[PDB]
Amino acid sequence: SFPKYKPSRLATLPATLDPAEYDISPETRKAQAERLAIRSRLKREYLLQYNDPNRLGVIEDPALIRWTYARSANIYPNFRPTPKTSLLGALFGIGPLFFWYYVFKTDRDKKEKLIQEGKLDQTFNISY
Amino acid sequence: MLKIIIPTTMLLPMTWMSKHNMIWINATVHSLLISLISLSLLNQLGENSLNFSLTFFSDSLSAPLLVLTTWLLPLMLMASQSHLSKETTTRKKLYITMLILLQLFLIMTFTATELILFYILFEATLVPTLIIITRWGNQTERLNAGLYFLFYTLAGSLPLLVALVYIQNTTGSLNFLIIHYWSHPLSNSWSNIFMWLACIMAFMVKMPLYGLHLWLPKAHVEAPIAGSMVLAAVLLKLGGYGMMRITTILNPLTNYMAYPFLMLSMWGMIMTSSICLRQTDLKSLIAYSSVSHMALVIVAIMIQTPWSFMGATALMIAHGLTSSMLFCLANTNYERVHSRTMILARGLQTLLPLMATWWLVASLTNLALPPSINLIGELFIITASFSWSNITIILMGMNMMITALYSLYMLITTQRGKYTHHINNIKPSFTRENALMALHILPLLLLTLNPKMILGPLY
Amino acid sequence: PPEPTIRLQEDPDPEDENLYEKNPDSHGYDKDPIVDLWNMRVVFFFGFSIVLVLGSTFVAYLPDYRMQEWARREAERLVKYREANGLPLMESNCFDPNKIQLPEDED
Amino acid sequence: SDAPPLTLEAIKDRVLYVLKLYDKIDPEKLSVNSHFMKDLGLDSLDQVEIIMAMEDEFGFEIPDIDAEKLMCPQEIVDYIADKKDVYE
Amino acid sequence: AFSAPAAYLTHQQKVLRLYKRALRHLESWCVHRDKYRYFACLMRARFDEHKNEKDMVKATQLLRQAEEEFWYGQHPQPYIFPESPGGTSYERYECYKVPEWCLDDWHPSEKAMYPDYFAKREQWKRLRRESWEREVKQLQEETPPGGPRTEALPPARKEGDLPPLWWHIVTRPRERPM
Amino acid sequence: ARQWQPDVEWAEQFGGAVMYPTKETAHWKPPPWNDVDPPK
Numbered sequence A: 001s002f003p004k005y006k007p008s009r010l011a012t013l014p015a016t017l018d019p020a021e022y023d024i025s026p027e028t029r030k031a032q033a034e035r036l037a038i039r040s041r042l043k044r045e046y047l048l049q050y051n052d053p054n055r056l057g058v059i060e061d062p063a064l065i066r067w068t069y070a071r072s073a074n075i076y077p078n079f080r081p082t083p084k085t086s087l088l089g090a091l092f093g094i095g096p097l098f099f100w101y102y103v104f105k106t107d108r109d110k111k112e113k114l115i116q117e118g119k120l121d122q123t124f125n126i127s128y
Numbered sequence B: 001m002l003k004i005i006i007p008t009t010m011l012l013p014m015t016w017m018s019k020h021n022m023i024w025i026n027a028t029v030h031s032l033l034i035s036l037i038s039l040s041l042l043n044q045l046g047e048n049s050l051n052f053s054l055t056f057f058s059d060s061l062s063a064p065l066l067v068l069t070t071w072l073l074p075l076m077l078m079a080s081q082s083h084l085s086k087e088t089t090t091r092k093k094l095y096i097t098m099l100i101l102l103q104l105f106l107i108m109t110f111t112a113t114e115l116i117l118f119y120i121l122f123e124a125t126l127v128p129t130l131i132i133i134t135r136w137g138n139q140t141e142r143l144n145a146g147l148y149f150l151f152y153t154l155a156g157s158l159p160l161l162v163a164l165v166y167i168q169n170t171t172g173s174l175n176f177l178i179i180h181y182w183s184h185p186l187s188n189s190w191s192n193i194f195m196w197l198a199c200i201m202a203f204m205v206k207m208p209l210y211g212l213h214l215w216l217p218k219a220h221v222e223a224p225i226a227g228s229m230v231l232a233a234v235l236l237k238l239g240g241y242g243m244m245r246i247t248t249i250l251n252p253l254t255n256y257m258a259y260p261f262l263m264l265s266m267w268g269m270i271m272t273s274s275i276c277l278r279q280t281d282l283k284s285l286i287a288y289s290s291v292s293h294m295a296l297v298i299v300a301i302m303i304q305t306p307w308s309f310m311g312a313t314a315l316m317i318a319h320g321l322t323s324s325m326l327f328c329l330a331n332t333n334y335e336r337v338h339s340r341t342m343i344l345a346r347g348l349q350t351l352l353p354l355m356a357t358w359w360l361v362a363s364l365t366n367l368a369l370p371p372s373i374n375l376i377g378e379l380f381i382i383t384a385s386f387s388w389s390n391i392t393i394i395l396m397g398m399n400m401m402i403t404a405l406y407s408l409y410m411l412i413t414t415q416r417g418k419y420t421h422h423i424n425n426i427k428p429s430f431t432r433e434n435a436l437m438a439l440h441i442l443p444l445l446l447l448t449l450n451p452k453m454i455l456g457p458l459y
Numbered sequence C: 001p002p003e004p005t006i007r008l009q010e011d012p013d014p015e016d017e018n019l020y021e022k023n024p025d026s027h028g029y030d031k032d033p034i035v036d037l038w039n040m041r042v043v044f045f046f047g048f049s050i051v052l053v054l055g056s057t058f059v060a061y062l063p064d065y066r067m068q069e070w071a072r073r074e075a076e077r078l079v080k081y082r083e084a085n086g087l088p089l090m091e092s093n094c095f096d097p098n099k100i101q102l103p104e105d106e107d
Numbered sequence D: 001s002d003a004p005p006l007t008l009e010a011i012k013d014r015v016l017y018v019l020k021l022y023d024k025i026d027p028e029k030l031s032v033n034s035h036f037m038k039d040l041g042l043d044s045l046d047q048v049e050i051i052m053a054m055e056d057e058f059g060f061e062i063p064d065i066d067a068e069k070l071m072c073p074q075e076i077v078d079y080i081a082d083k084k085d086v087y088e
Numbered sequence E: 001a002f003s004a005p006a007a008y009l010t011h012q013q014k015v016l017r018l019y020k021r022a023l024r025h026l027e028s029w030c031v032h033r034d035k036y037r038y039f040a041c042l043m044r045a046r047f048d049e050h051k052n053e054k055d056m057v058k059a060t061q062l063l064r065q066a067e068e069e070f071w072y073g074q075h076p077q078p079y080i081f082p083e084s085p086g087g088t089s090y091e092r093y094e095c096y097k098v099p100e101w102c103l104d105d106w107h108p109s110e111k112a113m114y115p116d117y118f119a120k121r122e123q124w125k126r127l128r129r130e131s132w133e134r135e136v137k138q139l140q141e142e143t144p145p146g147g148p149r150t151e152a153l154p155p156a157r158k159e160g161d162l163p164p165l166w167w168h169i170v171t172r173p174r175e176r177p178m
Numbered sequence F: 001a002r003q004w005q006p007d008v009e010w011a012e013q014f015g016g017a018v019m020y021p022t023k024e025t026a027h028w029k030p031p032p033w034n035d036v037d038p039p040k
């Protein structure tokens, strides 16, 4: 017996210790076959487009354009106001502002009060 | 001043009667000649100003911005010379006409001894920019970007007109000299609060302030190259110049009306610096960097101390030059790649070494490296804000670290690494692009020798 | 469905024209070699040679209108006079008290 | 660096030198075209051990997918030459 | 790197890979040669004792505790060859590999030097130009309907034919271009 | 490599009777090209 390796979000389970590929069924083999098939189809298309002597440009990648469009220009049309989204927006967009305002207001009030009492020793503070 | 305004006007008939294959040469030569004439304005005196006449006056705040505005136009022409090759003669002449009109409006704006004339030209600077963005733009989102840029500005600036005419009705004059000499305190009242908001919001929307910056990434991304540089270099400084001119009548209300804007800017600098880290686009990244720097300038202006004003002016000039250079480099990359994506083209330093050097220098300058004027303005604002409150140093240091991080990320992703295999149209860089980068960067390293020329009137 | 699947009549998207292929030494300015070369010449001459150097020297040698040396000399004379006569250097009141009139409170 | 430009005959000599010190196989019977599973009767684990020995001796490591399908000294020499870009 | 992969790894391949990794990490643990040989022989002995097992359920039951034991004693700082994907000089020279097509952008003054090299370059370009036209048709007629199932490419079958998609494998820059 | 310009699909947005079509105005028809209606 040996201590077990407990995976986490930032330290994933190794492939060797994973149990999915030890419980092998014919449908799993079929799935791996289809995955390799589509991957090889994409690879063949790319290689056909890549070794062409006539081509003198950049091979357009549909995956990259799709990723960029999803990241940038498709966020709002799929956005819906929900309690989770609304709460997260209110918190992350309002809380820091008021927190910093309170901190700076308190600090400046304390400094001004000390100035009014005159017990601050502002000697040599010429530049401001 | 007319020795500057008149030649800029004569640039239009000069362009329109030029031969079909010699417009660029004439425009560039005479724009450079005009810049030399503008150099004379830099010799300011410790006294009031160079009051040329009843309509135009020049200060040591207007002089650096005027010189930068006159210097930018040749660079805009050299940048636009590339993608306008297949354009008809009439449309190229119209493009040069729009650029010349923009320069003329900016020149008349920056002096503008009267505030209503300043506002009129400040809104006049909006038409040629909108035409440039919506006409000579590549993407299909240029229309929405133009609408956003128009309406965000106009909604903020419309109450400013009412505030100005009200001030003229009560005070009796809007001449800046009379306004400065006859200034009186603003009592703490709701009417005075709304006057403050009306007079401030019009300039804060254009800077832009965090929360009203949504128009800037769109306008910078969808615009052509020349529109991008004129937006990032000069058009952003209009708000700060107006704010530093107009805060002379808002005292002592500002002493407590600056809190929302100070908090918004000091948090939005961090937010946009963080946003720059996770970006799939180059022009968007540069636009967000500009937003961060302008937020720092907003903080400096709202602090209202001599060191704040000096640092604000220095940062204005430095950021203008740096952002123009970065947009130039991004455009040169996009012209060969035709994609405008950061990770699509990699390892370009192996193929284009000199452009890699220009990228490194621009990133270092953006990184606020000493003794460049970027860090001079940065450090002046940091010290002034520290005097304002000792806790601001945390936010400013966080901003500095994130700025370094995203600048070097931009450099590394596009320059270092292994080149992309399926791109074989990376032709060697032309002399035009190298000259453009050199003319962008050399003035910065030259101004670092004579900082007093860009430190503003409170030097 | 006998539709042509063509939405409209359009030219094919033209391919980018390399400026080096038809003209080495291309300078990236114009496709006409003579106009291109002269554009490069005037840009380099008026940008680097005329503005960036002559203007830099002109700004370097600008006359001192800000009155820095004048202020130094005035401060030197003031300090010498006040040290020689035992005056306390800088004065706390910017404006003399006699000229100023303060409204009486009597509260 | 001062590394000599190793050539095909040098690679073959080194391969045969490593193999001849593997006492499971007799030096006289082995040839450059000899097999491993059939002509020499070696186990799969034995072949892995030979591959690791050449790995250690040549200073570069062979990926498993390419190491598991090398069965003759000649094709091992060819693989090493292709890796190291040898002309002749 | 050269050979195309299969959709899955057989039990034999898993056992062989585990054996290689275990021997490598044992060598890393046992610095000296005699100790390494002794413990490698011991590991081979403990590795071949289940060589002749017949049922696959028990064999799959094994090679699981074996992997767990390997993960427990894996020497968290193993030895990596300098050119390996973890080595000290993995991608050291990847900044010196300039693509071949860059030579098409050279100035004629630069091409004046090395004339014979550029003549051979034109010959190679013509060869590629004809070979591509032949290869596209050969690959089109050879692939099964519905798309390829594995990324293995066929060799050249006729006399004057060349292997399909050869230009970017033949014209790799070098191992150490500079 | 080409500046985007509106196509037929983009132009059809302004071809309706009014902008922002709704359920009530879905059955409205654009006026005839010449301002003449059939005599019926």
Ligand SMILES: CCCCCCCCCCCCCCCCC[C@@H](O)O[C@H](CO[C@H](O)CCCCCCCCCCCCCCC)COP(=O)(O)OCC[N+](C)(C)C
Pocket (backbone or CB within 6 Å): B003, B036, B037, B038, B039, B040, B041, C050, C054, C055, C057, C058
């Ligand atoms: C060894 C020397 C080293 C230093 C060299 C310094 C050279 C500096 C040259 C650059 C000058 C910058 C331009 C300055 C323009 C501002 C001043 C200008 O507006 O003044 C005008 C006068 O300008 C001059 O007359 C013309 C100068 C224009 C040309 C400058 C020299 C370089 C020109 C290069 C052009 C291209 C050369 C050829 C290329 C092929 C009008 O003066 P005015 O308001 O009445 O003066 C009233 C006061 N008065 C009565 C005492 C006179």
Ligand SMILES: CCCCCCCCCCCCCCCCC[C@@H](O)O[C@H](CO[C@H](O)CCCCCCCCCCCCCCC)COP(=O)(O)OCC[N+](C)(C)C
Pocket (backbone or CB within 6 Å): B188, B189, B190, B193, B210, B211, B212, B260, B261
């Ligand atoms: C969203 C992106 C950024 C956009 C711009 C943001 C900046 C706008 C924020 C406006 C700045 C402050 C506004 C008012 C400041 C005055 C201080 C006041 O708020 O505090 C208390 C005032 O009490 C209450 O606040 C009264 C006002 C309450 C109603 C105002 C709306 C509050 C929430 C609305 C937020 C919406 C902002 C965005 C609109 C689109 C003090 O009470 P009191 O000492 O007796 O009165 C002081 C004024 N006196 C001396 C002249 C009499």
Ligand SMILES: CCCCCCCCCCCCCCCCC[C@@H](O)O[C@H](CO[C@H](O)CCCCCCCCCCCCCCC)COP(=O)(O)OCC[N+](C)(C)C
Pocket (backbone or CB within 6 Å): B064, B065, B067, B068, B071, B317, B443, B446, B447, B449, B450, B454, C051, C052, C055, C056, C057, C059, C060, C061
């Ligand atoms: C390629 C490898 C290197 C080759 C180069 C080797 C040579 C090394 C030299 C490079 C830097 C070394 C440092 C040497 C500095 C000495 C010169 C310096 O001292 O002069 C400065 C003067 O330089 C100028 O002030 C700075 C240039 C002016 C900036 C204007 C930019 C040009 C216009 C272009 C448009 C601007 C766009 C932005 C508008 C704001 C400082 O002036 P100052 O110490 O006080 O006294 C001058 C003399 N006085 C006493 C008579 C007054």
Ligand SMILES: CCCCCCCC/C=C\CCCCCCCC(=O)O[C@H](COC(=O)CCCCCCC/C=C/CCCCCCCC)COP(=O)(O)OCCN
Pocket (backbone or CB within 6 Å): B152, B155, B156, B159, B162, B163, B166, B191, B192, B194, B195, B196, B197, B198, B201, B205, B212
């Ligand atoms: C990017 C979008 C930004 C939108 C900016 C819009 C908000 C700008 C701030 C308010 C604008 C209107 C202010 C009015 C112009 C100033 C004129 C003035 O100061 O005169 C006041 C008049 O003050 C007013 O009339 C103000 C009325 C405001 C009505 C319109 C309300 C608009 C929205 C108010 C809230 C917005 C504030 C925050 C906006 C944040 C940005 C979204 C003095 O009144 P007297 O008649 O002289 O009285 C003296 C005798 N006792």
Ligand SMILES: CCCCCCCCCCCC(=O)SCCNC(=O)CCNC(=O)[C@H](O)C(C)(C)COP(=O)(O)O
Pocket (backbone or CB within 6 Å): D043, D044, D045, D046, E011, E012, E015, E022, E025, E026, E029, E046, E047, E048, E050, E051, E052, E053, E059, E060, E062, E063, E066, E067, E069, E070, E073, E074
């Ligand atoms: C320091 C780190 C220590 C790590 C320790 C690791 C654990 C060591 C103990 C491992 C336990 C086992 O053997 S797990 C045993 C796994 N099950 C089997 O081996 C059944 C049949 N084996 C085969 O068929 C193979 O192909 C074979 C015949 C071996 C070769 O064949 P070749 O003819 O093609 O060479």
